[PDB]
Design an enzyme around this catalytic site. Structure first.
Site, PDB file in Angstrom:
ATOM      1  N   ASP A   7       0.887  -1.151   0.000  1.00  0.00           N
ATOM      2  CA  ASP A   7       0.000   0.000   0.000  1.00  0.00           C
ATOM      3  C   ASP A   7       0.926   1.201   0.000  1.00  0.00           C
ATOM      4  O   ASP A   7       1.365   1.649   1.059  1.00  0.00           O
ATOM      5  CB  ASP A   7      -0.847  -0.023   1.263  1.00  0.00           C
ATOM      6  CG  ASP A   7      -2.259   0.408   1.013  1.00  0.00           C
ATOM      7  OD1 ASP A   7      -2.458   1.615   0.752  1.00  0.00           O
ATOM      8  OD2 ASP A   7      -3.158  -0.465   1.069  1.00  0.00           O
ATOM      9  N   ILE A  19       0.268   4.225  -0.974  1.00  0.00           N
ATOM     10  CA  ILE A  19      -0.626   5.361  -1.139  1.00  0.00           C
ATOM     11  C   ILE A  19      -0.030   6.712  -0.684  1.00  0.00           C
ATOM     12  O   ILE A  19      -0.566   7.771  -1.001  1.00  0.00           O
ATOM     13  CB  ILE A  19      -1.917   5.072  -0.365  1.00  0.00           C
ATOM     14  CG1 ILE A  19      -3.097   5.703  -1.075  1.00  0.00           C
ATOM     15  CG2 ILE A  19      -1.798   5.582   1.066  1.00  0.00           C
ATOM     16  CD1 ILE A  19      -4.413   5.491  -0.341  1.00  0.00           C
ATOM     17  N   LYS A  27      -3.776  11.044  -1.031  1.00  0.00           N
ATOM     18  CA  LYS A  27      -2.763  11.678  -0.221  1.00  0.00           C
ATOM     19  C   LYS A  27      -1.819  12.591  -0.987  1.00  0.00           C
ATOM     20  O   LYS A  27      -1.700  13.768  -0.646  1.00  0.00           O
ATOM     21  CB  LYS A  27      -1.971  10.621   0.554  1.00  0.00           C
ATOM     22  CG  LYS A  27      -2.843   9.518   1.157  1.00  0.00           C
ATOM     23  CD  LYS A  27      -3.924  10.042   2.090  1.00  0.00           C
ATOM     24  CE  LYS A  27      -5.036   9.017   2.203  1.00  0.00           C
ATOM     25  NZ  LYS A  27      -5.881   9.180   3.389  1.00  0.00           N
TER      26      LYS A  27
HETATM   27  C1  LIG Z   1      -6.235   8.138   4.135  1.00  0.00           C
HETATM   28  C2  LIG Z   1      -5.792   6.698   3.826  1.00  0.00           C
HETATM   29  C3  LIG Z   1      -6.486   5.920   2.854  1.00  0.00           C
HETATM   30  C4  LIG Z   1      -7.698   6.486   2.132  1.00  0.00           C
HETATM   31  O1  LIG Z   1      -7.551   6.345   0.728  1.00  0.00           O
HETATM   32  P1  LIG Z   1      -8.946   6.657   0.018  1.00  0.00           P
HETATM   33  O2  LIG Z   1      -8.747   6.649  -1.453  1.00  0.00           O
HETATM   34  O3  LIG Z   1      -9.437   7.993   0.438  1.00  0.00           O
HETATM   35  O4  LIG Z   1      -9.950   5.617   0.382  1.00  0.00           O
HETATM   36  C5  LIG Z   1      -6.040   4.608   2.571  1.00  0.00           C
HETATM   37  N1  LIG Z   1      -4.955   4.082   3.228  1.00  0.00           N
HETATM   38  C6  LIG Z   1      -4.271   4.799   4.176  1.00  0.00           C
HETATM   39  C7  LIG Z   1      -3.072   4.169   4.880  1.00  0.00           C
HETATM   40  C8  LIG Z   1      -4.669   6.122   4.495  1.00  0.00           C
HETATM   41  O5  LIG Z   1      -3.981   6.826   5.459  1.00  0.00           O
END
Ligand SMILES: *Cc1c(COP(=O)(O)O)cnc(C)c1O
Ligand SMILES: *Cc1c(COP(=O)(O)O)cnc(C)c1O
Lengths: 417, 417
Positions: free
Chosen positions: A216, A218, A257
């Site tokens: 992940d 992200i 993010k």
């Molecule tokens: C904020 C966050 C998400 C949210 O992603 P979305 O696309 O808004 O669902 C997912 N994983 C982590 C670790 C986050 O901090």
């Protein structure tokens, strides 16, 4: 008779409503609770606004995007995402757009990849502390369960081989089918990027047992200090491991993010496994990104000066702010786990804890949200195995607001001995 | 080692396939297969583009929406949908924007409403011929099964209360737990709106056995002739049905079919059950409409004049086309089921067959999709229990194309006797 899911339906939500019932606003309620519990990145929206204006317009060929409904999406979208993912990882690697898949935000990308790699009953290993949405996201409609991998403060919550193994071997001993492990890199709530070796030490344990490694990443573009962010992708381009099953390697992504566009619901799934790629695409129909938003992103992420200016600028501000909030706490004697990325910092409020219980922890928490009036997140909320840690978010407000939150913390701690 | 779903993965695609290879086009391919197998509504896109050149803010507050991420959605979105759902169902019955829940198109709405109502292994009753996507949407990730209800052309494919009881009891002897029955009204592929008394029957039997009645009224605003469209919500309002338990009634809706915006993924779940509403909301995190598409739509659907003219114009254009198309098919003897809704007609090609066997329907189907170069849908793909029927979509092309298509048909029929 409702299904079991709907039929089986609040403690850590205390700060959640304390806020909603008294949100801070410079003019409307200057003493209300200051939202510091949501990992949001608004430090660079101005840069996106400037763009949506002149460089050029972008959003609305309407008929085409209005009627387009292929699970592959607009070609430019895939290309742009793949392109954007590249610059994020320093061009160090390349991404094949044909592999880019959509999902309803990271939420849906997560639930989907799980639907694709584990059956109900099976388990997935997760290092803790870990983002709590997982408890629902990876477990609610999938039936899959979670098994935590311990992490202490003594070693900065680093993921150690011994710990990864110990957790795993225990599952086998408990007859629990472990089909994979899901990392978060850059980390949440740790806010730290993963060490190159550490990743190899995980991929290998993962490869060595033919179980999947779901990364992940992200928070890839929210890095603002050394070390550099190392994508699991980059570790698939290194000689030392040219012999790793790319079938057990998957990446999860979103634009929530590092571009702060959660509302756009841009979930992305990039598998190295052709089969997984497909199933995720077939499933992507339950959470397809809006053609209108796709068209908007294709155009935006195609502007290199922008995608290159944004990335660099975004790193600056986040750093500028993190440092400030860090010095802010260093002043009143509060230490944070040292981090280089993310939209938050893992705060050590252990020296404020009476005893060393999560109960002692929750009490401190009730105080920060009722008397300090800051909505932060308690470590026990991320399944942190040691009391005293609180995740605090600083990327969703003004410098002014942050300094206030900082001032409020000064009085709290100040009056703590 | 993928999951069972990911691992558990093209007969009726020769049509979609053929078209992709030899796609029709007035100038660069005047003899390409014509796309008459997609239920797309394009007759009024011109109306939307026109509107897009005025009031108010069609699409940008950006930071607010780019970051808005409440499962409830933008303030004005729910209200707009509800006002739209009312104008749709006559404006006679009322809708509560607070009960409006999002999902990824009808696809997501459907999967979710089953996730909420039935457990894996349970079954739902489905009249047939029915929407082929159901077989994935309702069963794939849900472990739910569909039980067909017999319908023939001897009675214009109507759902008889006898036919419903039989499927119900037939299923029980086999020990299948029927948790509900899901209708499509207006009907796909029949393109017919349901007899008010018929709804009142399905709802009585439904309520009398404590099973849910889900209504896919995704075609509500495509009625182009009498009778009028009667929403289940209206039925819940009559004195004659005051004692019907509203816990078991639900509505699945979308803007794809009536508004012609599938690429927008505007799925809507509207349950009369407060718990279902709550659960469906929790589930919307996986398939939320993009705050951008929400903003845009709130602005469009909040324009009474646009909405009135739109619905009114749509009914006339769909009416002019449907008639023209049917009158052409009658010129050559080919007749269809009599309908007042949809974006297609239930064409009866039983007399062009050689035997009342689906092996003849498929034989004919190929002829139609290779030599006549028209991509339609074979009744059997809709689980239709009798061969010879075909769904032919006439709402996505030009008047020029329809006549071309009719011409090809006037020929094929010519050289067949
Ligand atoms: C904020 C966050 C998400 C949210 O992603 P979305 O696309 O808004 O669902 C997912 N994983 C982590 C670790 C986050 O901090
Ligand atoms: C077209 C259709 C759908 C799909 O709606 P989308 O919003 O495009 O996903 C679902 N159910 C029925 C009965 C349909 O006709």
């Amino acid at each position: 008779i409702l299904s079991k899911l709907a039929t089986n339906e609040s403690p850590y939500f205390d700060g959640w409503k304390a806020y909603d019932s008294d949100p801070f606003h410079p003019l409307k309620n200057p003493n209300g609770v200051i939202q510091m519990g949501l990992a949001e990145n608004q430090l660079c929206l101005d840069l996106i606004e400037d763009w949506i204006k002149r460089n050029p317009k972008g959003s609305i060929s309407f008929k085409a995007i209005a009627n387009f409904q292929d699970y592959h999406g607009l070609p430019e979208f895939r290309k742009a995402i793949a392109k954007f993912m590249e610059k994020t990882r320093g061009g160090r690697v390349r991404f094949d757009p044909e592999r880019v898949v959509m999902a309803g935000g990271a939420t849906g990308a997560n639930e989907t990849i799980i639907f694709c790699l584990a059956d109900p009953g099976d388990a997935f290993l997760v290092p803790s502390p870990y983002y709590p949405a997982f408890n629902r996201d990876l477990r609610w409609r999938t039936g899959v369960q979670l098994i935590p991998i311990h992490c202490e403060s003594s070693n900065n919550f680093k993921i150690t081989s011994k710990a990864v193994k110990e957790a795993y071997e225990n599952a086998q001993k408990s007859n629990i089918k472990v089909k994979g492990l899901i990392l978060t890199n850059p980390s949440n709530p740790l806010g730290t990027t993963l060490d190159k070796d550490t990743l190899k030490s995980v991929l290998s344990f993962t490869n060595q047992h033919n179980i999947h490694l779901v990364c992940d990443e992200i928070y890839a573009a929210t890095v603002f200090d050394t070390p550099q962010f190392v994508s699991i992708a980059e570790i698939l381009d290194e000689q030392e491991m040219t012999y790793c099953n790319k079938d057990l390697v998957h990446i999860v992504y979103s634009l929530s993010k590092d571009m702060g566009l959660p509302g756009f619901r841009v979930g992305i799934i990039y598998s190295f496994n052709d089969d997984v790629v497909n199933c995720a695409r077939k499933m992507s129909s339950f959470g397809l990104v809006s053609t209108q938003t796709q068209y908007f992103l294709a155009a935006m992420l195609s502007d290199e000066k922008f995608v290159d200016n944004f990335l660099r600028e975004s790193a600056m501000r986040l750093g500028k702010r993190h440092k400030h909030f860090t010095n802010g706490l260093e002043v009143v004697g509060i230490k944070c786990l040292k981090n280089n990325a993310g939209l938050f910092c893992w705060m050590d409020l252990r020296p404020l804890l009476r005893e060393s219980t999560f109960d002692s922890e929750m009490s401190l928490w009730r105080v920060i949200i009722n008397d300090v009036k800051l909505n932060v997140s308690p470590g026990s909320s991320f399944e942190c195995q040691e009391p005293g840690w609180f995740r605090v978010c600083f990327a969703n407000m003004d410098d002014g607001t942050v300094d206030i939150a900082l001032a409020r913390i000064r009085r709290f701690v100040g009056v703590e001995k």
